[PDB]
Amino acid sequence: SWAQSRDEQNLLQQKRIWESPLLLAAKDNDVQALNKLLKYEDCKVHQRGAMGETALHIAALYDNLEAAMVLMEAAPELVFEPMTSELYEGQTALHIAVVNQNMNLVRALLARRASVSARATGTAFRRSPCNLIYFGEHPLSFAACVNSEEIVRLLIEHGADIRAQDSLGNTVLHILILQPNKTFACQMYNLLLSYDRHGDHLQPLDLVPNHQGLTPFKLAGVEGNTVMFQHLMQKRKHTQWTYGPLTSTLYDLTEIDSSGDEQSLLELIITTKKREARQILDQTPVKELVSLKWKRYGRPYFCMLGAIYLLYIICFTMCCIYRPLKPRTNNRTSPRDNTLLQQKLLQEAYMTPKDDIRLVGELVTVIGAIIILLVEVPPFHVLIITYAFMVLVTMVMRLISASGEVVPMSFALVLGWCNVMYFARGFQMLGPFTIMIQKMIFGDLMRFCWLMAVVILGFASAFYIIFQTEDPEELGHFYDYPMALFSTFELFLTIIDGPANYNVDLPFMYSITYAAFAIIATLLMLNLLIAMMGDTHWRVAHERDELWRAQIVATTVMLERKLPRCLWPRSGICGREYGLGDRWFLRVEDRQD
Template sequence: MDSLTPLSFYNNVIREDFTKDAVFRAVSEGDVEQLAGLLEFLRAKDKRLSSLDFTDKTTGKTVLLKALLNLKDGRNNTVGVLLEIAEKTEDLETLINAAYTDPCYQGQTALHVAIERRSLYYVKLLVQKGADVQAKANGTFFQQGAGLGFYFGELPLSLAACTNQPEMVSFLMENPDRRADPTQRDSQGNTVLHILVVIADDSTENTEMVANMYDRILVQHYKLNKKSKVQLESIVNNEGLTPLKLAASLGKIGLLKHMLSREFMDESRRLSRKFTRWVYGPVRSSLYDIGSIDTDENNSVLEIIIFGSEMPNRPEMLQIEPLQSLLQNKWKKFASKLFLINFLSYMLYLVIFTSVAFYRKDGEPPFAINDPEDYLSFVGELIVVLGALRFLYKSITQFQRRPPQIRTLFTNGFSDILFFLQAVLLLLCAILYCSGCREYVGLLVLALALAWVSLLYYARGVKQLGIYNVMMQRMILGDLLHFLCIYSVLLFGFSTAVVALIKEPSGTVRTNETLVPEGDFKSDPSGCRKPGYDDMRHTMMELFKFTIGMGDLEFTDHVDYKSVFYILLICYIVLTYILMLNMLIALMGNTVERISEQSETIWNLQRAFAILDMERALPRWLKTKLHSRASETVRLKNDEDTTLRFITVAEMNWTKWRSDISTKLEEDPENTVVSQGLMGIVGPRLVSEELSNSLATSTEDHSLA
């Protein structure tokens, strides 16, 4: 029976037994006949459907919510009856917008339920009758990180978008009664675009769905609000992130790629972040908008990706255009030169450090300065200490910006830790030196060794060396570390067994050759005393020699239980020398094969670290100059406050041959320089007449000489 059947049809009999349970049972079954006489009953008792008599006191669920939760084939005939009753009892708006009071589902209204049930019919009916399109369902079930639940952004529009209902989204944004505002934010400051980024999971199907919904909302909002200065994509959430930056921070690589290369061909072209300049066969030249991407803006996409230690797919994200070309451009324009200067400076520092350690004086420190050589040595020591202070400050700054974690050691944390340890050892060495302790020498040589190992940081300046260094780090922090953990247990265990088994005869001393009586050694101390095999450290060193094939059996002559000793020795050699070493070699070979391709992307990330670190160290005026020369700045026509910056990228796709793009900015690929996949900045024709219809050039050519 139709849901809009007049109530008079059911009011022939006036009932007096309407209770909450009876009404709830009727609407859950969709039985309109059981509601006959309800209107007269409410009028006689002066009650409303939204009153507590017809509401679940535990959850706040009303009869309308109960009816919408029990749709059959998308319909429940009692919904129309309930709305008509509420309208005649002047309770319509209250009933429609009544929400759950239960902490789990708090704020959920009938409109939310109708959207979740994918019923466009009832959504239209509810909106027409006065449903609040900005009602927020903010119960724990709808909060992010609440465990079992669904975070959709609290608002009806975001719920429709997250459940992939494009017609529902269009209706909510365009209906003449009450339009949903996509600029509205939930309790976490997220708009519907932020929510779409959150639900993306990088699968092909999900990415396509989210990208289509994202573009639909963006375009519809633009068409409905062309005169508005509020840009939907520029709204930030409580963390200060726009949807683009949120996609970068969450590592949503599929959606991020779509957002960065978004290109519209219709009247919404102003929303594009990519403009096709020309196409020739499989090659095309494109202009990419680098607003919010480059480091001229605080908390840019580049900085989020490079310094975001929580994202495991950062190396892959940097391969997306225009990020890859932008980093390559920075490296070619200035970073490679600065990197070379830093490398030469560090080499000079190492030479000074090595000379100071090699030509140090013997005796009790600190040493007096009496001659020119002493002055020269003092200057060298001062340079070394100042360098250590600089490394310490830089390392602490890096740790504050991105705290060291296990997963970051594979990217850039390894070098940071080496520089930090080197600086700490040097400063401790300086303190011991000034305190007159000769033990400073031990810390000095350890710091020197770390300083030379830290030189591997500069291997990232050369691709092959950088990839080799990445593989070495992965094997040290992976296979070798696991090997050492197990090997240390075996070494210590067998060493304790050998020490317990071998006891040096009392009254004897071990020399270079053999055991001699202690009295003979005192009378003729020409021999060199050696530690006995009851010494744990000596025994562990001897067993370690067996592991690397350098051990000998000269100490077995003094074993009382040789058979037991041989059993221990054979088991130790089989487990370590034969089994574990060969397993380590096999694992390392497998690691090299497995991460050969991944190592290149990690090297790209490490080089990106270096580029941004060097860029941050530059003066502001110089950074501004480099930014302006690395791209083109244009100003939107009739908008003096909005500027856009573009970088030109050459793309080649041998599976895509479309050349009939009607919105190309240029007919011929003239005056264009292609270099290693990066399009150089060209002359005054960068912004063609077609693009100038919507963009007005504000600067002349900024190409570098």
């Protein structure tokens, strides 16, 4: 009900103007009606609309220069007049005539000396999904996005600063990147850099960060505007010789590669949620870098880390498949034929120097688990952190030496093995299968488990009530309700044989009810899930090399934030020896057509 208040305040505009004879005459270009209305009788110029209108705004708004030409004699000051509030704050008609692509009142408003530094700080201008557009504050920023080139040139020649910023600190170059017209506004980026002319010592306007620290070049990758991003890259390259079809370009690589905690571009591509920002990875100075950062120094450190984790888990299972485990020298089986178990897990027997090997092997896991936690003092981290807890839980479970120590080990073990699937990504032709797991679970199953869980709560609740009458000595599939659900779930997945005795009679309802479950769930609801998961695999494998490439970048950056220098140099050829300065470049070779 929030956007309703916008429209109520927008209908009132259509009401206040409709009830005022002045501003209704401001709508239609009836000069002769305005002559009798203004020049003859006295009328106030400050008739404020629903959110701060003037008639001079309305004549600007409904494409009326001719009405606005009448106003300038009566209104010397409404040129400077802003709009009041709550959608439109600080907006004046200088902003408005720009938005309507021209009026030539833009000339006349500057002939009345309109302030070009006025800030449209209203709610409707600030960046939001609720707003269909984002043009910033200053009217110079407005003319850029609408592509009115001479009107832009009319603004610089009247002293509009290109270096002006909004509430978010975005300059006008940042606003150009946010446009869905990509190549259509890309020419404006060429135009406005020609108006850098007074070189500021701070920046030459092309490196200016916002309040969240974004240069427009880094903003281009984060917003995924590849068409913008190529064109800014055309400036960044510095080519060497060409050799027939061969060409030696030399890309800049300053903001792209990691710097002295600059928070490089490759980080912010991964951390953002805009999926089309990962289209930046296929751009040719980027794609070569992360290939070079992987084929050297990325892959062998990763494979060295993988072999350690293998020997960690093998050391874990070996001290976990060997456990103390006395015979059940304690009490006899008190429920008949129920408590089949005989071990009950020894207390403090740390003798038998085979266990001294096990004592050493137990310490290796505990030491390695703390290392993971000492890393993680600040989708797989949640596994490896909780892996380490279940090691520490069963460590404290054995120090207290309490009873239920199988459940932390069973939690630790499957999570211990399945967390080497993290290491499968650095072995291309095995990379995107992890992504196939994630979309099938979190994107498909967790929006289809909710439907299947309904049906099992029908039939398992049914089958229990059918077999409340029966002796659970024969077909004990449904002796109690909690295991009745567990029985039906394996019947849903076609695991259990299906309860059928052939020795005694079955109740009459079961044969009806099970064949119902056979149709609706075994062939029907199950294969629908298989049809879902089959579509996801084909949807993933069509694009898998981009997705493997996204894994390498996410790993390499994560390898940087968890590993110091002196064994990782930063990639790219250094400058400073070849007369190139502090910028670390890289070159690449390409045959043409």
